[PDB]
Design an enzyme around this catalytic site. Structure first.
Site, PDB file in Angstrom:
ATOM      1  N   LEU A  19       0.853  -1.164  -0.048  1.00 19.55           N
ATOM      2  CA  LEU A  19       0.028  -0.111   0.054  1.00 19.55           C
ATOM      3  C   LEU A  19       0.883   1.195   0.094  1.00 19.55           C
ATOM      4  O   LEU A  19       0.323   2.268  -0.391  1.00 19.55           O
ATOM      5  CB  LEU A  19      -0.926   0.094   1.218  1.00 19.55           C
ATOM      6  CG  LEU A  19      -2.165  -1.033   1.291  1.00 19.55           C
ATOM      7  CD1 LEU A  19      -2.885  -0.984   2.544  1.00 19.55           C
ATOM      8  CD2 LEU A  19      -3.093  -0.532   0.087  1.00 19.55           C
ATOM      9  N   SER A  21       5.435   2.651   0.629  1.00 19.30           N
ATOM     10  CA  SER A  21       6.485   2.557   0.880  1.00 19.30           C
ATOM     11  C   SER A  21       7.182   3.658   1.878  1.00 19.30           C
ATOM     12  O   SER A  21       6.976   4.769   1.538  1.00 19.30           O
ATOM     13  CB  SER A  21       7.612   1.977   0.287  1.00 19.30           C
ATOM     14  OG  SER A  21       7.182   0.742  -0.620  1.00 19.30           O
ATOM     15  N   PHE A  24      10.668   4.038   7.472  1.00 24.87           N
ATOM     16  CA  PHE A  24      10.638   3.006   8.676  1.00 24.87           C
ATOM     17  C   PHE A  24      10.235   1.609   8.258  1.00 24.87           C
ATOM     18  O   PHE A  24      10.568   0.688   8.837  1.00 24.87           O
ATOM     19  CB  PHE A  24       9.493   3.568   9.571  1.00 24.87           C
ATOM     20  CG  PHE A  24       8.166   4.305   8.629  1.00 24.87           C
ATOM     21  CD1 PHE A  24       7.584   5.181   9.279  1.00 24.87           C
ATOM     22  CD2 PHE A  24       7.802   3.834   7.580  1.00 24.87           C
ATOM     23  CE1 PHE A  24       6.864   6.324   8.604  1.00 24.87           C
ATOM     24  CE2 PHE A  24       6.924   4.445   6.653  1.00 24.87           C
ATOM     25  CZ  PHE A  24       6.263   5.971   7.460  1.00 24.87           C
ATOM     26  N   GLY A  25       9.606   1.491   6.871  1.00 25.72           N
ATOM     27  CA  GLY A  25       9.440   0.218   6.509  1.00 25.72           C
ATOM     28  C   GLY A  25       8.198   0.309   5.410  1.00 25.72           C
ATOM     29  O   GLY A  25       8.030   1.251   5.063  1.00 25.72           O
ATOM     30  N   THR A  26       7.710  -0.937   4.979  1.00 21.59           N
ATOM     31  CA  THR A  26       6.748  -1.101   4.086  1.00 21.59           C
ATOM     32  C   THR A  26       5.492  -1.573   4.487  1.00 21.59           C
ATOM     33  O   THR A  26       5.195  -2.520   5.487  1.00 21.59           O
ATOM     34  CB  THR A  26       7.367  -2.253   2.952  1.00 21.59           C
ATOM     35  OG1 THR A  26       8.458  -1.773   2.716  1.00 21.59           O
ATOM     36  CG2 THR A  26       6.302  -2.263   1.799  1.00 21.59           C
ATOM     37  N   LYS A  46       2.732  -3.841   8.817  1.00 18.39           N
ATOM     38  CA  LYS A  46       3.875  -3.137   8.451  1.00 18.39           C
ATOM     39  C   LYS A  46       5.100  -3.616   8.750  1.00 18.39           C
ATOM     40  O   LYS A  46       5.442  -4.211   9.994  1.00 18.39           O
ATOM     41  CB  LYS A  46       3.758  -1.919   9.067  1.00 18.39           C
ATOM     42  CG  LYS A  46       4.879  -0.741   8.774  1.00 18.39           C
ATOM     43  CD  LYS A  46       4.789   0.538   9.469  1.00 18.39           C
ATOM     44  CE  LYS A  46       5.705   1.625   8.681  1.00 18.39           C
ATOM     45  NZ  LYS A  46       5.283   3.020   8.894  1.00 18.39           N
ATOM     46  N   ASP A 131       6.354  12.181  14.730  1.00 20.07           N
ATOM     47  CA  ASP A 131       6.351  12.207  13.363  1.00 20.07           C
ATOM     48  C   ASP A 131       4.975  12.617  12.810  1.00 20.07           C
ATOM     49  O   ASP A 131       4.631  11.713  11.839  1.00 20.07           O
ATOM     50  CB  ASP A 131       6.846  10.718  12.715  1.00 20.07           C
ATOM     51  CG  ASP A 131       7.177  10.807  11.521  1.00 20.07           C
ATOM     52  OD1 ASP A 131       7.394  11.924  10.698  1.00 20.07           O
ATOM     53  OD2 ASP A 131       7.339   9.906  10.641  1.00 20.07           O
ATOM     54  N   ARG A 135       0.711  12.264   6.028  1.00 21.55           N
ATOM     55  CA  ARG A 135       1.037  11.220   5.583  1.00 21.55           C
ATOM     56  C   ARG A 135       0.861  10.149   6.711  1.00 21.55           C
ATOM     57  O   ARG A 135       0.836   8.873   6.312  1.00 21.55           O
ATOM     58  CB  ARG A 135       2.563  11.180   4.972  1.00 21.55           C
ATOM     59  CG  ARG A 135       3.510  10.930   6.002  1.00 21.55           C
ATOM     60  CD  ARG A 135       5.052  11.144   5.653  1.00 21.55           C
ATOM     61  NE  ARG A 135       5.870  11.524   6.480  1.00 21.55           N
ATOM     62  CZ  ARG A 135       6.535  12.882   6.844  1.00 21.55           C
ATOM     63  NH1 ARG A 135       6.231  13.485   6.007  1.00 21.55           N
ATOM     64  NH2 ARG A 135       7.180  13.131   7.616  1.00 21.55           N
ATOM     65  N   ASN A 136       0.654  10.530   7.947  1.00 18.51           N
ATOM     66  CA  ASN A 136       0.519   9.583   9.167  1.00 18.51           C
ATOM     67  C   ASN A 136      -0.654   9.859   9.761  1.00 18.51           C
ATOM     68  O   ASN A 136      -0.856   9.589  10.912  1.00 18.51           O
ATOM     69  CB  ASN A 136       1.753   9.946   9.941  1.00 18.51           C
ATOM     70  CG  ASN A 136       3.013   9.256   9.483  1.00 18.51           C
ATOM     71  OD1 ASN A 136       4.293   9.943   9.830  1.00 18.51           O
ATOM     72  ND2 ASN A 136       3.115   8.266   8.563  1.00 18.51           N
ATOM     73  N   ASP A 149       1.060   5.338  13.096  1.00 12.78           N
ATOM     74  CA  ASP A 149       2.491   5.305  13.180  1.00 12.78           C
ATOM     75  C   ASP A 149       3.247   5.754  14.374  1.00 12.78           C
ATOM     76  O   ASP A 149       4.326   6.154  14.654  1.00 12.78           O
ATOM     77  CB  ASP A 149       3.206   5.985  11.960  1.00 12.78           C
ATOM     78  CG  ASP A 149       3.494   5.172  10.664  1.00 12.78           C
ATOM     79  OD1 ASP A 149       3.837   4.211  10.992  1.00 12.78           O
ATOM     80  OD2 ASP A 149       3.203   5.925   9.688  1.00 12.78           O
TER      81      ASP A 149
END
Length: 295
Positions: A19, A21, A24-26, A46, A131, A135-136, A149
């Site tokens: 979904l 990238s 921190f990860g995918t 995630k 953060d 986007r979060n 997140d």
């Protein structure tokens, strides 16, 4: 409470699709298969010392608020994988970009309220997010958004979202979270514009010291822009508190046209009771404070 975190074996879930990238990860759309059952239950996964990781995971699993996503489970192998509720509408950043100029003031102001409610809950728990950004933030429904997140920043650099003292000294507090809230609000009000676009991260600290800030979005009245500017004051204790931001945006939401100027806004009202009821029965049954409507 360790009953809040389910330890899953990799045999009872599978990642099916990416979904997004990050650094921190995918993040994957995934399926959970309860042992002994035949059903495939859609989830979000995630993939990023175990005791240090689990210690923080238990905190993330303890987050219980309508506007912050809770960690539901974890699988530790060679990799750390996190499982949370899937939200089909996706991140609010994509949402505002894909709906640019087609979002009503009632939605924007209410999102600001909800994000500030989620951050206040973290602040009361003495937890710092580190953060916060569009986007979060995730969309549960158009009427219901949730911060995600939480915990990862501490567990594992967004210069353009960070308070000066965070840039210069890696100091993170609730009041640096307020700075990032200001940038997040700016993102929403500009429908996902990139902050300080075209400017090297290396010079952001010097730009801020000179007193330069993100520009007034075209739809924001001076009163709304002033809140953003207050969020970016050099003195951390001179910035707003999330508790105050809840109250301020809730007031603006009661007279939304007074505070945001948006073309066609009069046909972009909150959903009818009928439609709000349908949305909830279908994808949002959790308890939540009523959205603020216009007087």
């Amino acid at each position: 409470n360790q009953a809040l975190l389910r330890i899953l074996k990799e045999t009872e879930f599978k990642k099916i699709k990416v979904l997004g990238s990050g650094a921190f990860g995918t993040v994957y759309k995934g399926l959970w298969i309860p042992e002994g059952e035949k059903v495939k239950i859609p989830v979000a996964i995630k993939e990023l010392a175990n005791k240090e990781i689990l210690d923080e995971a238990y905190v993330m699993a303890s987050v219980d608020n309508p506007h912050v996503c809770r960690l539901l489970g974890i699988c530790l192998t060679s990799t750390v994988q996190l499982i949370m509720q899937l939200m089909p509408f996706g991140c609010l950043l994509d949402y505002v970009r894909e709906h640019k100029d087609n979002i009503g003031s009632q939605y924007l102001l209410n999102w600001c309220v909800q994000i500030a409610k989620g951050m206040n809950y973290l602040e009361d728990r003495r937890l710092v997010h580190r953060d916060l950004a569009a986007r979060n933030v995730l969309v549960k429904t158009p009427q219901h958004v949730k911060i995600t997140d939480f915990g990862l920043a501490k567990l594992l650099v967004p210069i353009k979202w960070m308070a000066l003292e965070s840039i210069l000294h890696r100091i993170y507090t609730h009041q640096s979270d307020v700075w990032s809230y200001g940038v997040t609000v700016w993102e929403l009000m500009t429908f996902g514009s990139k902050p300080y676009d075209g400017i090297p991260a290396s010079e952001i600290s010097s730009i801020l010291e000179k007193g330069e800030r993100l520009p007034q979005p075209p739809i924001c009245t001076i009163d709304v822009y002033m809140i953003m500017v207050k969020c970016w004051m050099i003195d951390a204790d001179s910035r707003p508190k999330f508790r105050e931001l809840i109250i301020e945006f809730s007031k603006m939401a009661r007279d939304p046209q007074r505070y945001l100027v948006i073309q066609g806004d009069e046909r972009m009202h909150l959903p009818s009771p009928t439609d709000s009821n349908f949305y909830r029965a279908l994808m949002d049954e959790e308890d939540m404070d009523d959205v603020v409507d216009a007087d």
